[PDB]
Symmetry: C3
């Protein structure tokens, strides 16, 4: 059981994914491992990038702000069904990792970046529930409340365990473990508040907005401060800083579904996410500094959520300057998924290099 | 005059109440001291636990949400009068400590945990004023404003001195002194805003909500971070973390009396306090890990304030799920006061062990 | 190019303006330098103190709360025209410093206190635009929007560069550079939101309130914590702590011009600024501890902005206690400008000691 400070000392990268040049590991480097050891949990980010595109292309087809485009609702069918086959494929071959190689699953659970991808399978299930195709689900005002209790049940249980460790004083408190991926532990409170309103429970939705709001302020302020996260915070603007955009984008969508209006509390959350979007994508090294990794799928997710919030802003404020803002953020987000979709098929079948040896879990406990 | 870092180095416990095994002290250990040296200031927490129960049992008898119980208003008489004899008894035998043993009162004033119990005598006086029995005070719309100026006068003067030391840069700023008991310096801004509304001054009440709100956010965020408070922050969930519940509970009651409605600002404060309540009391080691101390009286206080805020939530949201929540939080809080009431009478008169030698004030200034 | 930690190690004072007793510098101490090296950027604070008095004396003459005084609107003429000759005089002789001595301008740009006075020339231009005399500008509902784009254009470009460096992880992030003068990088978001409303753009004004609100909370919380700013944070209450008052004062004026009412969000910002005003000016050492410096002009600025916010509070809450509060804050602020105006004319022409050798820029890069 490896300490949290030992992962920062032995690993290197914005995600702690490479071993340093002077570290010894417990497994061979050049021999090919069995497949269930080379399969990380970070490929639930492929499911986050696809299931968030099914929320967008239903909003583009069913909103009065974008009626002039005449977008067919069959784009939501093919993205919802393809995101549901990938989700049932990744989840089945990760349960087989827990049966045969459970000692490697525990190394990922205490890795300070990969804690937050255990929240990720249950956020994908809530994106597929607030965006069901109307071909499958007609004639309904409310979803059934048992859809909420099965998906937000294990999210809330794992949330009590992690948040209780943050405010206590031993060895995994937030000042020793924080990184930009810690925002993924907060954003499911706002996705779960949208899905609680659409089963008919507006007071449980107000409960989940307030626990997500209080823990967003703690993580946002603590990342501006002097704490032993050294290599996981890059020296200049990296694409990993897109995780800041996800929680104010989902907080403004959630407050609009609860109260029915895009008021001054919902605009303040939307305009914080829009400043962080501009100060990250409006550069020249964001486009020319592209190198593929599977962690790019999870950086697309919070830029698609910000496109959904600017469609709902274009409904409250009508006119041409808000139509043009909503169509230019939802063009950049879908054009990166199409780049990631083709370069994932080329790395899998033409070059065969999606799954190398996962060397970051095999480090030694004690020595440098 | 002992430095703040020397109290953390020489003392041990969640309240800094025991000396470590290698420390020498200025007074004998086994010989019995005079009584006014063995009498701490932390037994103003007995008055906080009793005077907060008089606010609850008047709310249970005078609210339309709990009319079906037919609770007599003579439970408020016997708790208000018993909390007023204990308050005039503790305050008289602490003035005699200041006359004869003022050098020991100064050691408690610079102790980083026991600073906050100098705010405590004036919060008890405001709990007894917002909960007077209607047998004594009938036919009144407003209290007299001089009741506010005598009790909130010395609270506000001592507040300017302490908060000015927090933001400055010398030797007792908040990053060097912070602990969970520092929330007791913030909560009297919200109790004083309830009592300012009930004398007819709604603009002074809005002033006191805003100074309590800004300093709640500073103390809440700074306890998640790397600062030299080492032993006063336990490694797992201790009952000392109930001090987090007190200030969001009183902030939601105060905003309701000012504006007359339990709106979306008042619900956000109530739902933060309810999450911290669940993640602290809904365990198995909260009930089986009971050891008596007089510091338990002060951990009952913020769980009674959270019962008052859920009675006022049951009035805004009518129906059976909010009646059952209000009756289950106000059962847990009154059943712990009844445990503490019997075990305080047994430790005082049957075993005679309430007041041992107060060894934490007699430490040396310099050496380890 | 000198590191940020080397400025804190080699310089001494609340503004880092003196060299320590064991430091060697690159230029002579006793020989008189050329004039463009002895001319700091901190004398844009003379323009901040004068242009903020033109906003006050137009509010005193055009508000229904202060109609009983019959103040002539010719006090706004003589202060607006005098603040506009000083602004065009300081700006012309600083462009000549950039042409001939650009290596000294770069030493001021990386000095951790003097970064924030590069934002200062564009805040002065927005104070002169929201307070134009009605003799020059009659018969207008809205200003032209190109007035906004020329003054807030270079403010917003320099804001993206600095705020992007704060949240990243290399060498000039906020935990390594913070001081009380860092609030001057935040306050132009609220002055620019007042001027965006008065050209007819209320959605750009709501964008600028939200970016200024989120970065106010980061700077306010980070100054309560343990970071290597050592000498720039004085041990007791210095006049440099008046920079805390500026941003909540301008945030309450800005929210009132956008929404047209002084509601519960605007009162919470005003009452935070009023507590910080009382806990800084209501002492005896604030008045008897007066020593002149040119940095005093910039400490007058946030006490004049707090006088403008209490005139607008006296309009929402009518009655004698709010008239007397507005006239006693706007008397203290104008009586210090009159002290600073006479002591600046005496130090310039009678004693000739406004511009000594600016020794803080000539330090060596490496050794102590």
């Amino acid at each position: 059981n490896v300490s949290a400070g030992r992962y920062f000392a032995a690993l290197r990268g914005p995600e702690l994914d490479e071993v340093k040049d002077n570290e010894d590991i417990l497994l061979p480097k050049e021999e090919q491992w069995p497949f269930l050891l080379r399969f990380p949990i970070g490929c639930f980010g492929i499911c986050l990038g696809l299931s968030s595109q099914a929320v967008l292309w239903l909003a583009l087809a069913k909103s009065p702000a974008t009626n002039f485009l005449h977008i067919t609702p069959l784009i939501n069918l093919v993205v919802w069904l393809f995101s549901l086959v990938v989700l049932v494929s990744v989840s089945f071959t990760y349960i087989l990792k827990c049966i045969f190689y459970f000692e490697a699953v525990k190394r990922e659970y205490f890795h300070p970046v990969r804690v937050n991808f255990f929240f990720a399978p249950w956020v994908v299930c809530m994106f597929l529930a607030i965006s069901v195709p109307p071909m499958f689900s007609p004639n309904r005002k409310y979803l059934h409340p048992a859809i909420w209790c099965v998906f937000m049940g294990p999210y809330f249980f794992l949330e009590l365990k992690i948040y209780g460790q943050w405010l206590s004083g031993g060895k995994r408190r937030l000042c020793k473990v924080a990184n930009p991926s810690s925002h993924l532990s907060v954003v499911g409170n706002f996705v779960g508040a949208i899905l609680a309103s659409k089963v008919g429970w507006d007071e449980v939705a107000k409960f989940l907005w307030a626990v997500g709001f209080a823990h967003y302020l703690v993580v946002f302020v603590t990342l501006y401060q002097r704490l032993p996260t050294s290599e996981a915070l890059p020296k200049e603007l990296h694409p990993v800083y897109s995780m800041f955009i996800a929680a104010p984008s989902a907080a403004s969508i959630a407050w609009n579904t609860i109260y029915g209006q895009f008021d001054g509390c919902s605009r303040t959350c939307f305009f914080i996410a829009l400043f962080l979007y501009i100060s990250l994508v409006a550069r020249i090294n964001f486009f020319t500094g592209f190198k593929f990794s599977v962690a790019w799928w999870s950086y697309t997710f919070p830029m698609t959520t910000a496109s959904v919030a600017t469609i709902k802003y274009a409904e409250a404020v009508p006119g041409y300057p808000s139509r043009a803002l909503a169509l230019t953020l939802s063009f950049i987000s879908t054009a990166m998924v199409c780049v990631l979709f083709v370069s994932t098929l080329l790395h899998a079948f033409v070059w065969q290099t999606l799954f190398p040896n996962d060397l970051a879990i095999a480090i030694t406990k004690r020595k440098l």
